[PDB]
Amino acid sequence: GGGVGVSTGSYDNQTHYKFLGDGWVEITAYSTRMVHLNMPKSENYCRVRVHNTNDTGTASHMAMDDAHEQIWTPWSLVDANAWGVWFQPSDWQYISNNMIHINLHSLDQELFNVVIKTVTEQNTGAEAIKVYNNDLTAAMMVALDSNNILPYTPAIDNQETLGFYPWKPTIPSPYRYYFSCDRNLSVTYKDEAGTITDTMGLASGLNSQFFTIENTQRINLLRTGDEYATGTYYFDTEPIRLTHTWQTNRHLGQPPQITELPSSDTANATLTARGYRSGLTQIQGRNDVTEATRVRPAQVGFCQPHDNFETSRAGPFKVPVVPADITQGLDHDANGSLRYTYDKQHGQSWASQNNKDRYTWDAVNYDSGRWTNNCFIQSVPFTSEPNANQILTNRDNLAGKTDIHFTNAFNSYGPLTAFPHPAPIYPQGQIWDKELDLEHKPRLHTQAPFVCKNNAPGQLLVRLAPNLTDQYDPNSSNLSRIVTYGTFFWKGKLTLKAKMRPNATWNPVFQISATNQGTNDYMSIERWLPTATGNITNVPLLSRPVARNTY
Amino acid sequence: GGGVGVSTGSYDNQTHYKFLGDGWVEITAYSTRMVHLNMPKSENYCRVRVHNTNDTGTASHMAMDDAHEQIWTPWSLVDANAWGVWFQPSDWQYISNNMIHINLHSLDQELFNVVIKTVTEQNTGAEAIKVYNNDLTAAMMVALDSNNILPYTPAIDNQETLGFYPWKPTIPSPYRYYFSCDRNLSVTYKDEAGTITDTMGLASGLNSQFFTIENTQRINLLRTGDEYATGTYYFDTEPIRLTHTWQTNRHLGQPPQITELPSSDTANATLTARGYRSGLTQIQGRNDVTEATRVRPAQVGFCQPHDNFETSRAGPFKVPVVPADITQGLDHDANGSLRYTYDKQHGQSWASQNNKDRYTWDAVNYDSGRWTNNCFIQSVPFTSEPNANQILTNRDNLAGKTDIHFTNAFNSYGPLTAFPHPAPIYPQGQIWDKELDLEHKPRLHTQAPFVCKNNAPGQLLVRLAPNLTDQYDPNSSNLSRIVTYGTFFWKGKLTLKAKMRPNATWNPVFQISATNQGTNDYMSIERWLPTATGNITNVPLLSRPVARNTY
Amino acid sequence: GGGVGVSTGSYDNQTHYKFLGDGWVEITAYSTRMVHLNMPKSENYCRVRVHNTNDTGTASHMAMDDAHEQIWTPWSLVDANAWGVWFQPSDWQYISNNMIHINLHSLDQELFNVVIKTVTEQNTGAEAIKVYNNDLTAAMMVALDSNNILPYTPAIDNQETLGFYPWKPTIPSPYRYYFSCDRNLSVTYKDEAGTITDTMGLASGLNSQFFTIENTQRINLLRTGDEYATGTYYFDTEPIRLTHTWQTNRHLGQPPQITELPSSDTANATLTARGYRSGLTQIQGRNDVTEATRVRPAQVGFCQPHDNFETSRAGPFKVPVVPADITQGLDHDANGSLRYTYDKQHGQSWASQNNKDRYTWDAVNYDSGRWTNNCFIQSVPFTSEPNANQILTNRDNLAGKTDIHFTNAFNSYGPLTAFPHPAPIYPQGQIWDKELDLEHKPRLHTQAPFVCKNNAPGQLLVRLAPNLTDQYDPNSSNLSRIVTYGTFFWKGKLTLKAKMRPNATWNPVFQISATNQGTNDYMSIERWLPTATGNITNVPLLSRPVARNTY
């Protein structure tokens, strides 16, 4: 039934595993959080712009332009989409070690045990004590967008998603969305003489969309005895593979046949002379077959233009880059490794004195990466031993500039390209993402493993209904209202399908394992353990431990 | 039943054609070979590396690096995948002339009439005669991988597939596969001062996969009376088109309307002045319509970076190139023509004194090729009669180098690109290939027309069970064993679906035809005929004789 | 049916996993070996004694006495009982990481493809070549003891079990058993004056048992077309736990309550003064409660007399010792760590030049160990700060001897004792063992995890039936016979029940993982990989990776 003094829900954060048959596992993850909600700092939708001239007013700073236009709303969203919400670290280990692939199934959400209190300040003076007491008749406004009418706004982008710690309360993210505005920002280099345009445009009758929660949604009013339940949402998605691929474009197919087995363990085997070797190559005019020049089924990974900034009406932005292995040469940006910035709630440690903590994720697929300094292009007709003019190296100055090299602007993507789909990032990463409404769609989104084919799971929006004092003028500019805050429990259930991996290999596979403290190894256990004062940290776990045969 | 002195199979190499209805033909190809098998030169799995410093130790030789790491196995594979196995030359003619498209259906395989003999050397001395006699109790080990657990290893890559001549015995290919290892090879040009790293890495706990036939498979033991039969495998593939496309990007759509018909056969027709011509173009600011500048539905073929070497962890390798027509300008590498190297068994001639024979296949689709020296890019705003600075030609030195030109690094592939699927190569070419296990897959593999969507046909592995002498120490390093070899018949049946072509054209179509000896024409008949001593040669037949309307 | 030239069996070494429901896994392990068998070096049962006086004739060498009495038999046994036979290393990893407990179910065995050959030496002289040819009518004698009438003789004790490598042939162990004889060996120390008895006794009419295979068994004669199959044997055993226990006797129960949480991460918490602390202790006369003196539910592990040699009629022998953790003080013998000696077939490496390889297994249960130097006994009435006479330390000379201390002779075993059951040793270790026929039985056998409650699986015995020349005198002392050897395939199927482990822990659990080469870590991958020449090694894997809560 429900009422004052009766709990409307239950607190379940534990995770379960059912084995449904051969190799098939149904993973059910319950997660629950206490959520703290403040009266919004304004009652009005607001259209605001940030234009930072201090940064962009002077040359070469283009990359730091923040200028944009957004709609600020009194509403706040509860966003459950990150991996760190749903699983505790060991669960991620257990899944990552034993399962070949995994897929989303369904999502449920509930809100219950709403509590709303009002603040009053008694004994005015040096003491200035605050008094807290329940308003039983106050309500909380709740809205879910099933039809995805509102702009879709993943909270993890800013790391505003619900915290990762079951026993720590968490806060919603205030809901906001971009608004169409035009920006002109000229391109300059350091200490260049000239003037920078650095302007923003007036509103566009064509492009302007202003949405209002109240007009687009059905809002449920929740008092204390009330509870809200989302229906069961079902994902339509492709499963993702949990095993990394080691197998490079030069490891494909049949190896050459050795002449004879080596005599000692230190010796190296020998091959038929490249002049006499049989095989298939696309090089013209030479009689040779070499492991490097032999034809392969397809291109694995591809060179990408990196630190590419392109400018449409909105301004400059960096082109995304498909995450790939940073090779032995370690260069991150060419292969587009991800770099996260996050706070204590999602990570870091309460021991840390820094405002944020930062981590750089490297792709775990050791095949498709590109090591640029060793890439080169050779002139035609092909020749052995090219001279300086017959080969283009990564040391070659492009357009007469020192630090720019063709690998910056070179794009090898083509019909023969094949690359692995990047991997989820356990504590911090976006589980699912909505697909763009464009006709021609990208092969994959960069940050999120899962993309909803038809309709994304809805966004859950909340605000406190305003409490008004005795004196209210509808025409007044300033609004006096009772100081009020509230708390409620958020609960959700996330079902996943996964399948155990086979092992055909003789040798032991690599695994995710804890390690003794006292060595600096990344897996040293204390990082997963509480401190004396209760400080705890949650750090990215490597994913896809087990190798797989690509071909 | 079976037993000593009873044949367990029959020898059928002939090909059949059923006409199932209108235009539909079911092609059934039987093929059989006598296979000679030697006792393996070692009993042990071996992990060996070839690292050739002599070639790579000195600068600019990067392209010839063979360095890799492989697992050597005592097992040998019987690989039936090439076109030259299944068909005799005339069959290929008959199919290639009359049929619009063709598709794989099913594959069967059998092993029968196993014969195993032992070798002993009598009368030791100058005579040193060898004696051959049957071991009736010896067995041959046979394993098929249906689940494709082992690394997939097409034998044609090295041209080790079963021979193309029904009456000549053939040998298996020894089975081997790559093993993960890291290589660092620096990039240098000729006579460059410096040092070359040229190193290889230690084994990787992450990436190491060592597979063993015995652990991954079910092995059947075959004595003389025994026979082995694979079940029927079914392909899921897309059919391939047997007719070439002539129609270039400038042949698409409606031609301009001529003013009037010419007066004489030598005269040329005239068109409405380009100033007054109606049409559609993407050039801004000019009032013109020209056959070159008019909009076309799509890009046919595309410029490709050619002699592109990219380096991942394994080392440098050449990026594959979609085969396209070499244009009148004949340049092969830009359009990525295939070049085969093969032996007498698969080709060449027993008359030849060379170790191998070589052939360069040119694409038969005359539309999508690119002739680079005539490609150019023009500055914006567009203008007629560009000056030297307003146009980028293929004579223009890129990065201040003589032999490198933008067409080397230029990549035009894009959403508007369309190209024909390359064509099978009759005597030597890979019929089917397994698809990579990556999430994002290439549009086509380069060498093989057919790609198995789900699960490739299994690989068939054989070895002789070891015969041990009286004295066997399990702990001894060296293994003494009876010299032994064996032979067996391999039989297979390959079913294909194909459809007769229509002919709507007035004029005669081109065909594949024999030609009298005494002229040097490529089709001169004697190349398909035996010699006096029995020497025979089998050479690539042109494919896709009949033209087709693309649009 | 069967016959010459028809294989009677199939070669399957692969392993399977079925998931039968929630958490339950049925593990089926097939294993197959080629077995090489020599004509026995004698046709007669022989009663032989080894009495080594050279070692025992001089004082203090008692520990090396080998003297005993055995019955030598022409028969040889095929013994499949070791872990290294049934699993490849990765399988052991996979099981050891994911499964809480495991139990035996059933065992099958088969013999097939018997091949028997005869040896003759042709061309007598410097060449002296050997000729090998089949004897089709020769037979091999096969006997299985289901009723366990013969003395039970695990082959792993001497490491004579079938090899661990599927692709390497292996040899049987010659069957033999002890025979009752009495030995008198006096006890002496180094350089002690006196005489050593060092005698052995005459046969005992009471105790003499001489068994003969032919009289106790049904022997099957196997020619080439013959095959032999054991029925399905079923184990009755208790499952064993795959998770180690960390929880010491001082970790049991509720911890004391701290006064307050510490201020900083470096600080230590404080407890209520031991004078005022509540609790339960068995110490009389003192008002205290200390973590060391508080009562615990039971004793975990116990002190054991170590290097204890006791002598019955047969001679001196070391008393077995329950394997327990060697503590930080590392002392192995007090806690009875196992030490294995094994050859290339079962281990070591073909790279090794030593005759054998040796490994010392440490218990993986970190609770029940004893660190002796820190054990002590304190006088009664109890007191704080004991003087020298009030405490017995491990530095205290017992019986006026330097190196003997009470922990040598001290035995703490009692009703309150509890200890974990030791763990299987993957490459080398005894899977099952037969229970002694005594009325009062040990709680556990030391080497073997599993003990058959009722009737052990039978022992499989083989020999070659003798081939006689033309001249045979039954009364002759020497027996001339045809040199003959044979080979056959052994196949077996071992079914196991196991259950997946839950994980409730926040932190990541420890796992068995491969590790990159180049660091000396025990798990460095290359030890599981073949060498260039095919040398391979198989080393003990740590077991029971995952911790468990004892109480």
Ligand SMILES: CC(=O)N[C@@H]1[C@@H](O)[C@H](O[C@@H]2O[C@H](CO)[C@H](O)[C@H](O[C@]3(C(=O)O)C[C@H](O)[C@@H](NC(C)=O)[C@H]([C@H](O)[C@H](O)CO)O3)[C@H]2O)[C@@H](CO)O[C@H]1O
């Ligand atoms: C390229 C090179 O060899 N540089 C060296 C190196 O010593 C160092 O690089 C940086 O060193 C400090 C930390 O020692 C930086 O903080 C960078 O590390 C951080 C980061 O900010 O990205 C912080 C911290 O070390 C790590 N952990 C956390 C919880 O923040 C993370 C994390 O491990 C990475 O994401 C892993 O990729 O990285 C680090 O790059 C420079 C000094 O700048 O000095 C050179 O000698």
Ligand SMILES: CC(=O)N[C@@H]1[C@@H](O)[C@H](O[C@@H]2O[C@H](CO)[C@H](O)[C@H](O[C@]3(C(=O)O)C[C@H](O)[C@@H](NC(C)=O)[C@H]([C@H](O)[C@H](O)CO)O3)[C@H]2O)[C@@H](CO)O[C@H]1O
């Ligand atoms: C570019 C040019 O005009 N070059 C000419 C030309 O005369 C010649 O080119 C090469 O000539 C010899 C043979 O005359 C080479 O052997 C090349 O031909 C081969 C090859 O090795 O690729 C061998 C042989 O002629 C052909 N047949 C067989 C069975 O091997 C094959 C085959 O026809 C090709 O694959 C067809 O594309 O080609 C040939 O390229 C050079 C000398 O190098 O001299 C210039 O004047």
Ligand SMILES: CC(=O)N[C@@H]1[C@@H](O)[C@H](O[C@@H]2O[C@H](CO)[C@H](O)[C@H](O[C@]3(C(=O)O)C[C@H](O)[C@@H](NC(C)=O)[C@H]([C@H](O)[C@H](O)CO)O3)[C@H]2O)[C@@H](CO)O[C@H]1O
């Ligand atoms: C007690 C102490 O600190 N002793 C050290 C130590 O350096 C060393 O102890 C012995 O060292 C050699 C090898 O370095 C011995 O061979 C012993 O190791 C062996 C063994 O024989 O038991 C051999 C080898 O190192 C290991 N592996 C194999 C495949 O044989 C095995 C195995 O790791 C053990 O079973 C693990 O417990 O151990 C080793 O005890 C002595 C020299 O005797 O020197 C002192 O400084």
